Write a protein that binds this ligand. Structure first.
Ligand SMILES: [Fe+3]
Lengths: 544, 147, 105, 218, 234, 49, 319
């Protein structure tokens, strides 16, 4: 492409800027001497001048030839070249008519005040909706003072004075504890803190304030002192400071407008403002999308940080399944916990029936099996179990403190007495179900009903949201279907896996042999299977 | 002895730009080169002829033409351009060397020459043709293996 | 940090403590479903709203990846938001009255 | 106890648009429909003090809650929405845009006639109650026509609105019973305010820059 | 195709409460438009003659397909007219009362609920009374312990143009809370309109008629399910 | 990297990173610690954090 | 038997095949009778249509240890290859297999004293680079990279040698007038505002401050002069923002400063870098290093790319 087009592209995307690049004499001579050639006589005038300027006496004579002081040359070294913009002018739109209104968020979280005073203070928010005609303002000007009504505002001030005297030491201690080094935007502490500075609650978005510029950062922006404990920040990015630096200088008195107030703990710059008097809205092209935050050590969950700051959610992989086109859930968490204690009770009852000597002499109502049971050591896992194969194992220390053996004893003593007489009658007795199984089935049923109600509500929720134009899924989470990428894909077609080349369908490892071996050993014969059906089908055929 | 992998030797050419030939060494000792003339002229030296139709070789591997032109970087020159016994059987060190020289993240368990390997090889060769690349030295001990 | 930002409002989980029975019968609490559980752990992802009126015990809700939990006493009406991922840790006997509500009341 | 507790009377009088919108209709929309909204917003803000100390543009976004609106989102949105609407109309009529807005429309929508055609199409294509908006997208730096739901406003997507119309029936039922296309045509011919839209675009230019930088020759 | 069907009541002085004008615009103009529009678009489609009620379900497709809206609004508009009889109001008599009494406590409980639900609808919408005789089509839909009293009468609020048919509930009674209906008459005093409807205009018998149709629908479904059980067994 | 002047903005090749120099100039390397962040990290890790 | 069955992915089938092949009778032992028909049970997981899936199950046994007794129960779990679950309701978290994993500190019960002690046992994390995250505008099209600017890259030059809220703008009755923007911009005023002030004569007054009380009365000591009422003291004080003074700095923002420039005989601008921050009494310089390139050389890279250590920057062709 063309040079102009290329420079345009760079300015737009990369951020190129032709800075001054103040050089030494030895270097200036190097930059203005290598353009001709090597060991060749210097014919250019600037090259000869740079060669002569390598001597200190030559420079101290040339500075006196033009009549400049010793500091004048050093000041002229750091001079901005190129075209300088015209001095900006301040064109005020019209009369500025304002009114002191207390902040809407004045009482901080955790500070209780009298209700009637807060009511009389908040009463002023209703009066802000009235309109004022700006043109006729001059006509109604009254120079006589002592007639203005500011009781509400005064009341706010009264409350404020109390709150600062109450919480100044606490705020300073928190600033010293959480913030280590001072930076433009943090709380003024130590020698920089003078009594009488407006604290952070005083301010509120929408207030015009006058201040002076005290800091200028290339990447962050300008910092204006508004006479408060926290400085103000005007977002100006890196590339705009090529033209904005001619209009904004350190120590300039400026008029700003507060547009947002944030928490100083999470956000680096609590007060962000815009310029009113030096209006430079035509030179800002790069802007911040989200306000800067602190990634501290206390916050360990990124979701809490995202919800506190207000940014988008962490993106995840896009699932191909639909929330409506999927089966329900019919597995209750208490199923395992009840099944294990039920099996434990059955086994203990069987062991007591087998050896009545141990069961005799002790009351069946209360049986102290083990007095060393610990809730912390209830979960014990040992992978040394290799009776049949090398595999891990777990041990569960069931407590007899909550085992309901009262009804279980009666149930077993009623069931065995009937099964024995059924066996004596020439019949085989198969117990259909027990009470614990009925309770587990009831738990499964209520959980299934909960899931059914959830999906019945979801079927109506999807409809209405679709109708009224509302997001069905949380925006910002499933936005990338496969933008996250380059993962090895098992699938051959992605080329992340092999495909036949010259008929190379051969597969490394993936031995089906090991599997074949366990199948072959038990049932080597390659006979044709006759009966083939699922276990549920087998139960259905058995019950039929 | 040398280790399996890609080396990207820049053979000096008498006419035109220097021909960049990349040799892929296998575990057994096979050699498969890829040449670059003044034009794209992406050909292989596996066949007896000078031009082995690297495009037809990549198409016969089983990859779709659209995915082939979409995966490789700089698809303009790719669109303008119009064995399994020992070559594909790369060793354990060959996969590591190919993942180190190139930018692939294929797991170490895979020891077969995937079509993505040839795609990335052609991409790096056509990039080196434009000046984005670095040659390799076969005398370096990192390129040699000790039995 | 001296946290003035509890998890009841960070995650939009509106909890009304010590609710009066007239508002309960105005909403329809007794004419709802039932759910009973002892000491368990129920990982659940919400798809719709849920007004939970706990009846018997206590439930400690732990959001995904978090180390701080929120506790609900037996006399609270909790409204779990949409797209909520948490892990309800139960400790003792628990009963509730729930009614999943779609967009709107 | 109550913030934003004010109907914020329109710039013009209730009988300024009488030849097109009767003075009774305006009285009802502003007097009854709007007033009510404010009262309920005040009653809801009295209960929750955290959402009380927040600006309108921030309150709307914090009550939208990214798809799962809080029970007070609809009301505040309506109050803001209505305010924008009254001011989005001016006494007299609107013939054509001015220096900046007309140029931006010609750059974005091609021409002003195509803009009017697309606006009328989007207004008639809406189903049910809702609003139609002429907004300025920040990251794209262009003007677009977006149609929304009952109370949702473009502030939830960080877009600066310039002109809006109330497609809720309460607005048109009294003078134009069921000819909604007529109501649109009247609003676009003799009720649209281009000076207000130009002023709002001038205000938005402090947040989104519509222009090209001055690149040095170096 | 589908054509406007006149209101059962005279729709002139049938209701002094609802003006003829209101009827003329709501039904004469708005209902007509919906049906006409449907006719204009359904023409030559696969759904040339399919019953509108079936056409609705087909066009709901999550993604509402182009004609769903017109169709639904038309259907719903006709349910409304049916719902109101000329002189009207009173208490349900017959079996409805029993169901109502079991499901919600008293008539005075359903009345409060219906009135409240209608008021809280925001924007255009309808209010519905329905029988919960639905059945899912994914997974473990079938109920173990199937019991009577699992079917219930429910109050459902709906957004503009969506009818409980889409979710397979049983439509019984409806109010058009969309504004076209009451503005002219009450100038935005929506609660009043709701109240008048539930006092002077509700013919509970009309809904009771539909009630029993629905009970039989449910029965026929489970009888067909029994038939299926027989098939797989024998 | 950084260059003020005396460097061609348009690259010599269409798909390369090579930039020729018309005159003598200084190339600067602004010191910093580079990092490689995925799409998940860029959701919270933003500018001036 | 269970009335409600979950839609599990494990499909257990029973296969019964003939022992011997048809047509060939094997010898029958006198002691042991032959088994004509046999049956077996197999466990096979669901197989996807796109790719064949196998039952990657795990076998483990659990024993109920109570009252000095043991039980024999075997459990099989068809664990999927990806540990990540599509939804949280379908999580496999409700299980425990191995206690070897100890790195899962997050699994500490909050009710135990160990959870409270871990807050102090785990000190403040300093493994992070501890720097300002500096994004790349040039790398926005490609994979976005990050530069961590810290104290090792930035230095500070030591020697180098009323205010407050005014008010809140009230709503304006004549919205038609462009009074909403408090001040116009000299460059953009030719777009949103007609040249009325150019044809007419603008007022010589610049700043007009009118303060309205809660009762709706405009009060100001001077009719239209610049007098500001400060909030804390409610005392009318002049701004005097101009003060007949101009502030300028010799070192401007963005200037690259080499070494041996000798701006002052006391402190030299070390680190040969760019001025990123300008204060009233100090200057912050980001470290940089210049490279001299001859005409005809080639710079490998774009403007703001990341150059790792040991990367080719400039290629010189020399004899
Ligand atoms: Fe309205």
């Amino acid at each position: 492409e063309s040079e102009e087009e290329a420079r345009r592209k760079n300015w737009v995307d990369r951020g190129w800027a032709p800075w001054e690049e103040i050089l030494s004499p030895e270097a200036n001579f190097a930059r203005k001497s290598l353009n001709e050639g090597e060991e060749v006589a210097l014919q250019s005038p600037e090259a000869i001048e740079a060669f002569k300027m390598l001597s200190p006496n030559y420079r101290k004579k040339k500075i006196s030839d033009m009549g400049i002081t010793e500091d004048e040359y050093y000041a002229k070294q750091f001079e901005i070249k190129g075209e300088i913009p015209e001095p900006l002018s301040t064109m005020w739109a019209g009369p500025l008519v304002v009114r002191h209104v207390p902040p809407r968020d004045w009482p901080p979280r955790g500070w209780e005040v009298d209700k009637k005073e807060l009511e009389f203070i908040r009463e002023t928010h209703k009066l802000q909706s009235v309109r004022v005609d700006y043109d006729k303002v001059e006509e109604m000007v009254k120079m006589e003072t002592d007639d203005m009504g500011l009781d509400r505002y005064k009341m706010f001030l009264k409350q404020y004075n109390e709150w600062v005297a109450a919480n100044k030491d606490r705020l300073e201690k928190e600033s010293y504890k959480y913030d280590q080094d001072y930076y433009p935007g943090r709380r003024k502490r130590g020698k920089d803190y003078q009594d009488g500075m407006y604290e952070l609650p005083f301010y509120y978005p929408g207030q015009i304030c006058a201040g002076k510029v005290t800091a200028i950062h290339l990447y962050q922006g300008a910092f204006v002192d508004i006479g408060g404990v926290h400085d103000g920040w005007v977002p100006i990015k890196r590339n705009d400071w090529y033209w904005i630096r001619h209009h904004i200088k350190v120590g300039m008195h400026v008029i700003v407008e507060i547009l947002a107030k944030r928490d100083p703990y999470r956000f680096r710059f609590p007060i962000e403002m815009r310029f009113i008097d030096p209006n430079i809205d035509h030179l800002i092209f790069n802007r911040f999308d989200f306000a800067p935050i602190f990634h501290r050590d206390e916050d360990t969950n990124l979701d809490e940080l995202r919800r506190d700051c207000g940014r988008q959610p962490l993106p995840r992989k896009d699932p191909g399944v639909k929330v409506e086109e999927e089966p329900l859930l019919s597995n209750h968490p208490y199923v395992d916990k009840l099944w294990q204690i039920h099996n434990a009770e059955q086994m203990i009852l069987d062991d007591m029936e087998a050896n009545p000597v141990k069961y005799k002499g002790k009351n069946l109502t209360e049986l102290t099996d083990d007095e060393d049971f610990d809730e912390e050591n209830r979960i014990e896992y040992s992978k040394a179990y290799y009776k049949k194969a090398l595999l891990p194992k777990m041990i569960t220390k069931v407590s007899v403190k909550e085992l309901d053996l009262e009804a279980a004893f009666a149930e077993r003593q009623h069931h065995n007495k009937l099964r024995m007489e059924a066996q004596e009658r020439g019949e085989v007795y198969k117990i259909p179900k027990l009470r614990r199984n009925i309770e587990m089935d009831e738990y499964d049923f209520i959980h299934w009903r909960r899931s059914l109600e959830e999906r019945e509500a979801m079927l109506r929720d999807i409809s209405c949201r679709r109708a009224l134009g509302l997001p069905l899924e949380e925006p910002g989470r499933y936005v990338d279907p496969s933008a996250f990428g380059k993962d090895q894909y098992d699938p051959d077609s992605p080329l992340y896996r092999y495909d036949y080349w010259g008929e190379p369908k051969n597969s490394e490892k993936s031995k089906q042999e090991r599997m074949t071996d366990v199948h072959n050993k038990s049932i080597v014969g390659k006979g044709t299977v006759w009966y083939e059906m699922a276990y549920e089908d087998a139960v259905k055929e058995r019950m039929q | 002895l040398q280790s399996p992998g890609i080396y990207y030797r820049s053979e000096l050419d008498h006419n035109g730009i220097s021909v960049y030939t990349g040799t892929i060494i296998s575990d057994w000792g096979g050699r498969s080169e890829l040449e670059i003339d003044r034009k794209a002229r992406i050909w292989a030296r596996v066949s007896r002829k000078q031009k082995i139709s690297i495009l037809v070789l990549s198409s016969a591997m089983g990859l779709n033409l659209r995915e082939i032109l979409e995966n490789v970087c700089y698809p303009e020159i790719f669109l303008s351009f119009l064995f399994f016994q020992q070559r594909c059987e790369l060793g354990r060190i060959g996969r590591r060397n190919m993942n180190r020289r190139l930018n692939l993240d294929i797991p170490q368990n895979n020891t077969f020459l995937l079509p993505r390997d040839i795609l990335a090889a052609a991409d790096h060769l056509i990039g080196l043709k434009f000046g984005m690349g670095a040659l390799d030295d076969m005398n370096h001990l990192k390129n040699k293996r000790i039995r | 940090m001296r946290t003035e930002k509890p998890l009841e409002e960070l995650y939009n989980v509106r909890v009304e403590r010590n609710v009066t029975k007239d508002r309960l019968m105005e909403l329809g609490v007794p004419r709802w479903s039932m759910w009973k559980t002892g000491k368990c752990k129920l990982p659940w992802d919400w798809h719709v709203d849920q007004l939970v009126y706990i009846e018997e015990g206590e439930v400690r809700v732990v959001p995904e990846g978090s180390q701080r939990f929120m506790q609900f006493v037996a006399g609270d009406l909790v409204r779990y938001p949409k797209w909520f991922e948490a892990d309800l840790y139960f400790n003792d006997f628990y009963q509730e009255r729930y009614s999943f509500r779609a967009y709107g009341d | 106890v109550f913030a934003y507790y004010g109907l914020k009377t329109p710039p013009y009088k209730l009988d300024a648009l009488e030849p097109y919108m009767s003075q009774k209709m305006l009285e009802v929309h502003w007097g009854e429909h709007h007033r009510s909204y404010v009262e309920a917003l005040n009653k809801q803000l009295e209960k929750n003090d955290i959402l009380y100390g927040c600006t309108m543009e921030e309150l709307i976004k914090v009550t939208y809650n990214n798809g799962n609106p809080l029970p007070e989102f609809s009301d505040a949105a309506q109050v803001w929405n209505h305010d924008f609407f009254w001011e989005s109309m001016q006494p007299g009529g609107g013939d054509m845009p001015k220096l900046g807005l007309l140029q931006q429309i010609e750059k974005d929508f091609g021409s002003f006639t195509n803009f009017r055609e697309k606006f009328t199409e989007a207004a008639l294509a809406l189903f049910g109650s809702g609003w139609i908006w002429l907004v300025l997208k920040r990251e794209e730096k262009r003007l677009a026509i977006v149609k929304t739901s009952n109370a949702v406003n473009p502030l939830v997507w960080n877009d600066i609105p310039l002109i809006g119309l109330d497609l809720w029936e309460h607005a048109y039922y009294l003078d134009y019973k069921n000819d909604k296309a007529k109501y649109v045509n009247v609003f676009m011919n003799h009720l649209v305010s281009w000076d207000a839209a130009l002023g709002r675009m001038a205000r938005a230019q402090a947040f989104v820059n519509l222009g090209e930088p001055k690149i040095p020759v170096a | 195709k589908f054509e406007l069907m006149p209101p059962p009541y005279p729709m002139n002085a049938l209701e002094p409460h609802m003006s003829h004008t209101t009827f003329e615009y709501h039904w004469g103009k708005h209902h007509r438009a919906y049906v006409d529009n449907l006719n204009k678009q359904i023409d030559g489609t696969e759904l040339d003659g399919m019953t509108l009620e079936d056409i609705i379900l087909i066009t709901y497709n999550g993604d509402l397909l182009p004609p769903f809206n017109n169709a639904a609004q038309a259907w719903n508009h006709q349910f409304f007219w049916e719902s109101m009889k000329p002189s009207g109001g009173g208490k349900p008599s017959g079996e409805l009362l029993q169901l109502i009494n079991r499901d919600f406590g008293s008539f005075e409980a359903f009345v409060k609920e219906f009135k409240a639900a209608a008021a809280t609808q925001f924007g255009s919408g309808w209010a519905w009374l329905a029988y919960k005789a639905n059945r899912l089509n994914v997974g473990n839909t079938s109920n173990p312990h199937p019991t009577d009293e699992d079917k219930k009468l429910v109050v459902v609020k709906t957004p503009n143009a969506v009818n409980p048919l889409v979710w397979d509930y049983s439509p019984l009674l409806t109010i058009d809370v969309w504004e076209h209906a009451y503005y002219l008459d009450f100038r935005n005093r929506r609660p009043d309109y709701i109240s008048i409807f539930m006092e002077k205009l509700v013919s509970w018998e009309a809904v009771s008629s539909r009630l029993e149709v629905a009970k039989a629908k449910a029965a026929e479904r489970e009888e067909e399910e029994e038939r299926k059980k027989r098939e797989k067994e024998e | 990297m950084h260059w003020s002047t005396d460097v061609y903005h348009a690259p010599e090749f269409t798909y390369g990173n090579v930039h020729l120099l018309p005159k003598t100039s200084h190339l600067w390397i602004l010191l910093g610690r580079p990092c490689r962040s995925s799409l998940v990290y860029l959701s919270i890790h933003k500018d001036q954090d | 038997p269970d009335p409600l069955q979950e839609r599990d992915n494990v499909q257990l089938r029973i296969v019964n095949y003939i022992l011997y092949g048809n047509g060939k009778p094997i010898r029958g032992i006198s002691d042991t009778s032959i088994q004509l028909v046999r049956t077996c049970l197999v466990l096979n997981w669901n197989q996807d249509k796109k790719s064949s899936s196998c039952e990657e199950a795990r076998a483990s046994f659990v024993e109920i240890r109570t009252n000095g007794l043991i039980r024999h129960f075997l459990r099989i779990n068809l664990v999927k290859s990806p540990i990540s679950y599509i939804g949280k309701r379908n999580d496999p978290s409700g299980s425990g297999l191995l206690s070897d994993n100890g790195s899962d500190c997050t699994n500490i019960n909050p009710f135990s004293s160990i959870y409270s002690y871990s807050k102090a046992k785990i000190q403040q994390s300093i493994n992070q680079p501890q720097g300002t995250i500096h994004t790349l505008l040039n790398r926005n099209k490609e994979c976005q990279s990050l530069i961590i600017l810290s104290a090792a890259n930035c230095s500070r030059m030591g020697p180098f040698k009323s205010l407050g809220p005014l008010g809140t703008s009230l709503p304006i009755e004549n919205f038609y007038s462009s009074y909403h923007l408090i001040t116009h911009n000299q460059i953009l005023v030719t777009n949103y505002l007609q040249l009325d002030n150019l044809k007419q004569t603008f007022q010589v007054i610049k700043f007009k401050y009118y303060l309205m009380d809660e009762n709706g009365k405009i009060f100001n000591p001077d009719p239209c002069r610049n007098i500001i009422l400060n909030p804390f003291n409610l005392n009318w004080y002049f701004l005097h923002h101009n003060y007949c003074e101009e502030t300028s700095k010799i070192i401007s923002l963005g200037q690259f400063i080499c070494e041996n420039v000798c701006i002052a005989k006391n402190g030299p601008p070390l680190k040969s870098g760019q001025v990123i921050l300008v204060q009233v009494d100090s200057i912050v310089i980001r470290s940089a290093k210049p490279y001299l390139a001859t005409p005809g050389a080639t710079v490998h890279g774009h403007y703001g790319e990341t150059l790792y250590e040991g990367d080719t920057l400039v290629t010189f062709i020399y004899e």
